[PDB]
Design an enzyme around this catalytic site. Sequence first.
Site, PDB file in Angstrom:
ATOM      1  N   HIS B 151      19.541 -18.399 -10.276  1.00 57.39           N
ATOM      2  CA  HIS B 151      20.126 -17.169 -10.791  1.00 57.39           C
ATOM      3  C   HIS B 151      19.172 -15.985 -10.689  1.00 57.39           C
ATOM      4  CE1 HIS B 151      23.721 -19.090 -11.702  1.00 57.39           C
ATOM      5  NE2 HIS B 151      23.819 -18.906 -13.006  1.00 57.39           N
ATOM      6  N   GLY B 288     -13.973 -54.493 -20.977  1.00 52.50           N
ATOM      7  CA  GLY B 288     -14.767 -55.549 -21.576  1.00 52.50           C
ATOM      8  C   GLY B 288     -15.853 -56.024 -20.638  1.00 52.50           C
ATOM      9  N   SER B 289     -16.873 -56.627 -21.240  1.00 52.47           N
ATOM     10  CA  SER B 289     -17.971 -57.274 -20.541  1.00 52.47           C
ATOM     11  C   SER B 289     -18.435 -58.436 -21.401  1.00 52.47           C
ATOM     12  CB  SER B 289     -19.128 -56.302 -20.273  1.00 52.47           C
ATOM     13  OG  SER B 289     -19.631 -55.761 -21.480  1.00 52.47           O
TER      14      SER B 289
END
Lengths: 473, 473, 473
Positions: B151, B288-289
Amino acid sequence: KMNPIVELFIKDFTKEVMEENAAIFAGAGLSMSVGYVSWAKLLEPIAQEIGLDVNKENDLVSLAQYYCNENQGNRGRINQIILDEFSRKVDLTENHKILARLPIHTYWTTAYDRLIEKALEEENKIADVKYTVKQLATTKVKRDAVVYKMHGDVEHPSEAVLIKDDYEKYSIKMDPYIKALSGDLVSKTFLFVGFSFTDPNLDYILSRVRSAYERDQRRHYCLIKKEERRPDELEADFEYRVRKQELFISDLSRFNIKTIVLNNYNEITEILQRIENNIKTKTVFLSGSAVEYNHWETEHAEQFIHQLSKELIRKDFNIVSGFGLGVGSFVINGVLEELYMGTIDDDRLILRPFPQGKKGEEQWDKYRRDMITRTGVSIFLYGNKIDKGQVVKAKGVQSEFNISFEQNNYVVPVGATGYIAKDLWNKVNEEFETYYPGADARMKKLFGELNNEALSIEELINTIIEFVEILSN
Amino acid sequence: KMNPIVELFIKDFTKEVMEENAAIFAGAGLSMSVGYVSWAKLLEPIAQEIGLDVNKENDLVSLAQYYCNENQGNRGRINQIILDEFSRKVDLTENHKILARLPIHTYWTTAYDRLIEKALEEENKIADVKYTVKQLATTKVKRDAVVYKMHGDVEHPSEAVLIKDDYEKYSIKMDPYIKALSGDLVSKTFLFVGFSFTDPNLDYILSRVRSAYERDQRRHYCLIKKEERRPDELEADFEYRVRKQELFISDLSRFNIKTIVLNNYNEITEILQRIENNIKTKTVFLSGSAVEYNHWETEHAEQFIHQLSKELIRKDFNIVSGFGLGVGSFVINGVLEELYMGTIDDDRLILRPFPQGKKGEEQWDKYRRDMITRTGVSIFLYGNKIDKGQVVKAKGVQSEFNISFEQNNYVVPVGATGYIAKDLWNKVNEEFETYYPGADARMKKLFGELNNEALSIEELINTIIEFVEILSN
Amino acid sequence: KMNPIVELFIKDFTKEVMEENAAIFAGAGLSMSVGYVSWAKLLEPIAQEIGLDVNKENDLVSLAQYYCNENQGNRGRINQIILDEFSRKVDLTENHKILARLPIHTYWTTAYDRLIEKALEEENKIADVKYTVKQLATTKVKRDAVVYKMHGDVEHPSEAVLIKDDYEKYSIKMDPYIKALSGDLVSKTFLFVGFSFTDPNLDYILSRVRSAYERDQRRHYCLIKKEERRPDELEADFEYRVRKQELFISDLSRFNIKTIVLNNYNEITEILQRIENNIKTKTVFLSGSAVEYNHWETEHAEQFIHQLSKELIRKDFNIVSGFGLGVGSFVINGVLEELYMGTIDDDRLILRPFPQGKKGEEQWDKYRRDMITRTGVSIFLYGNKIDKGQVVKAKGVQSEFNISFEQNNYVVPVGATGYIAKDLWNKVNEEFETYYPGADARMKKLFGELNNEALSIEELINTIIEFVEILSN
Ligand SMILES: O=P1(O)OC[C@H]2O[C@@H](O[C@H]3[C@@H](O)[C@H](n4cnc5c4ncn4ccnc54)O[C@@H]3COP(=O)(O)O1)[C@H](O)[C@@H]2O
Ligand SMILES: O=P1(O)OC[C@H]2O[C@@H](O[C@H]3[C@@H](O)[C@H](n4cnc5c4ncn4ccnc54)O[C@@H]3COP(=O)(O)O1)[C@H](O)[C@@H]2O
Ligand SMILES: O=P1(O)OC[C@H]2O[C@@H](O[C@H]3[C@@H](O)[C@H](n4cnc5c4ncn4ccnc54)O[C@@H]3COP(=O)(O)O1)[C@H](O)[C@@H]2O
């Protein structure tokens, strides 16, 4: 300090901008340091397609026209190239930010990028950007500046002025823009930055203005960098290029456009910073509160403050005061004496008394920051209040000083007045290079004299005025 | 949770968006909560000038056409009104920001404001805004989304579709936009937000698509708020309005557009947030480890991690891992087993091993933040390293948990694995409402079961999978 | 190397395809080298039945229409002919396979055969084939490309566009396909291969697009073979045909379609191979592991690797690394320095650390092959590990080199780094023509300079970059 020609130009253009009758004409060169690749680099594949070489071509408009001719007048490739290049996200350079910060309400650009618009947006300024004839019929409400992109926008590549057909039909299609630019050139003082003055439309408009106004043309300014010796070139070729550039400048003078020759492109940033500083430092923040006026008597100190404010008003300075207890009334009296010779102009004296109560102290910090932001020079006097019946050095003045330093405002603590002013003067003298880098001998002498109790009212006021003037001018 | 119809719509539209085959059709109503005054309010003086009353008028297009007829077809006043209103600086609503964050590459807007463009810009996304027929011929490079302002734009008020003449000439002037919208409606799944379906152009386009495709039309979605009882209205009038809206929704369904009836307009924000959460939580950050695997043996824990990663891949989750020492190899093995049934899709597994050395640790923090930003769910396992020959709880996992919380990511610490995972589980259980506000009984039971050492590999993996699924789905 | 026009087209179209905004328009001529007999040969009995001669006829559409007119409009014979001919099993040509391998998501075909579909299937790509208006309303999930068979399918001979009635009713029956092709022509960059531009439907669509977009049409490309002197023809007739073809090509420029004139039809395959190579070689596989950095010190070699990776990222290369011990961290650091100026784009850096343990080594080979398949250029550095306390040349780098050679990837072993890299450089120099057939003098000089230990970091990096660029560009 810069060249005397540059200093005269800075003074004259600061005078023009402070009257809000100055306009900026920015060429494509103002956006060549931002990160956009050169237009010749973009046209290099375009030149190679039609069998030419962009390095051997100087008139890129004719090159683009030849390419369009080789493709039945189709511009899709060039439109895609300009849309891809000039719509990229690039960090604004310092020049655009300084120009946005300046009170300039008119920009005329031959560049398709939106760097000026973004710089105005980042300063919380309303920019009315115009690149269509229809857009001239509508004005944004409360706009700060209007930007006329007279060669089109990046987001509308098909309407960009790139080829000879566009230049030939510009006088018919974009005639209202020609009329607007003529009106601005005759009614406003222009500064041409990044413009090579090789644009046929600008040549046509300047020739029309010259034909209309003869020797009564308005003076305009341009910034042009001097020719640099290329590594391959010889001395004779460099001298020939220098002479050619000199002849090019006299010709521009034929249009009453004075050219400032700059050694490098960073001098544009230096000049813009100097103009911004000259505009900003004309507003002085007068701070302080005093119950006991150090060694001076009450009446003597009141007269000193009154005459200091009168001199500040007389020297074309706009005073912003927080209406501190014991200092505000007398600066008000000085301003009234200087102005009633009449009404109180809103620009000359801005009074911001602090709200009293628990509710006021909550917003006191933001109030202080807003008050200080209007200024570029901070002057501190005394700084003593009464808390439990005894004179105690104030704490609001210290906050003011901190805010002024955080806003990079010049601080002028008068140590002769004592208290927090003396403490601030001692702190500034402890690290003088941090607050006044590259200060001259006269500036150091004035700063040292600011803490002299043997000076009279007139001598101390003159020292303060001279220090503030060398800070501003 | 919301209505089952809303839940089905959320599932289906999340499925559509994750395939990047979804488009958003935004009406003016999506911008009516931002701060822009109503179009009827703007036309109120326009209606008063021609002797009408905007409150008594429902067809504002005919009202504007009558105003233009009373002024020989001139639109300057309406252009100025729309430019003044819709170009104001307004803070973005949450809906625009969520839509910008969603992977939606196609927007179709009947609003003149630039709220969608600003929302896309604030997300560091390249938006290709189109409101001119010429602009369809150029595409921005590396664009994230394309916005079709069908428009017109606010900065070009003269080309805005406001009056009956604009609607009557739209089919000729803006035919390429009609073709593009038809192609999108037949090739993309649309969501209509803020659209009243009273636009003649949209009715024409939908009727053409229906005539072309009969009962094989693509299903689309719309969000419509239910009728509310006005204070002046009676019960019978309210019931009549409800029946009228039901008939409207059923005719809308003639175009294969399913309507979701919402109690209020904040449910739009709730639905958008739910879709964004469903899209974001499908990527899980495995952290994580582990040198010592708490109570479980080394091989048992390796098999547990392998099968957990295999289940995560099988449940249509994208795993992002930092390749922690002792956990990274086995999640990699699980992903490889799940996928090699084949090649490693870049989306399914993103591996970001940390650089080793003094240079890497300088940018380790930014690397971790960038790695976590790609995910919406964080799963923590073990968290033990070796520093001086002894098992010491790691510190990188704590930083990862902090970053995940700062990014509002769901955290799933498995306390059965112990070490930093157990510490994080205890911390979460200390303040459960802070991390999981409005959690159900099943969610609390699963979180409590996450810290059970008596569970086998299969039981613990199933608990983790169910918790992550109820977080995502 | 090919003609400069061909080189410019290759660069521009590789740029278009890498942005995934390129479409392929394939005519029947693309399938005439596969083994299908000519359509005129099929119509020869059809022409003989109505008393005409197909050799004397140029408009075969009118010939088929005349045949249908002689049989009361019945098409059974022509349907049977096309079903019998174009449904035969024929081996795919190289052009179809290359086009399938290219990241092209849009094909538009006027051929009835399924060669494009089979080529896409043999590349494990999901193809969404469309030849019915209804099929436009459904989209395949996770499709790689969409094929619009705008003249019908071989398995549906009755709906094939063969006669004048089909062309005359195409604008009504197949209007959605016309709209889709117009949208693609205005939104995508097309390459016309095997198309004679004598199709009335394509002429109609191009004329409509031209009428809609004037000189702002999007640029497209076509590949046309030059006229060849027939044995019976004279020189004057050949020159007349050449001039006629030149006028034909210049009239396609009226539609903004640039034509590349090719000496023979194998140049189509050469151009496609060049585009595929340019796309594939932009991803470099960085390989190596180093405990001892040959003659260079540890810090010097780390800085060398860091700056090499930074230059690779700066030169628009996508780095794929296996995170080898001693090399992975520093290439990661270089990529981070080049990109953090920001987030890690998934395309720029793909990290594939190898799983550690007995389970990982089982799938290590497939992991390595999948990692290498993503690249087209392999760069090897050092190649030394530690096994029993002593520096031993690695064996994974040799496997990586073998996989790269098996995949026809360019190998760039840097002999200055030594160890397996030096061994590979010596092996390549032993048989240089086998790995670099038809190499230029500059390529040989760069390869020889790759094994120079007297070069600094900058010189060696520049040599590697130039070698990789002449391999890619
Ligand atoms: O002196 P300081 O530390 O800093 C001084 C600076 O502050 C501002 O003026 C002060 C102060 O004169 C004014 N004020 C007036 N009358 C009262 C009062 N404040 C507290 N009262 C309690 C009872 N009566 C008063 O309130 C401003 C805020 O108070 P502080 O910032 O704490 O004042 C100026 O700009 C001045 O530069
Ligand atoms: O365990 P944490 O505290 O946090 C664990 C998290 O961190 C990341 O993986 C770690 C760590 O496994 C890895 N790493 C591997 N080998 C070594 C090493 N780090 C230092 N080394 C010194 C000698 N050898 C090593 O380096 C990452 C950074 O080190 P930190 O963050 O301190 O490791 C994952 O995403 C994991 O989720
Ligand atoms: O050097 P090479 O022969 O080939 C080098 C190529 O391989 C890949 O990286 C290697 C290697 O750096 C890495 N790795 C790291 N730490 C260890 C380890 N491998 C065995 N370990 C035993 C104890 N600690 C380790 O494991 C990959 C596989 O091992 P190999 O292929 O045998 O390694 C890259 O892509 C590199 O290009």
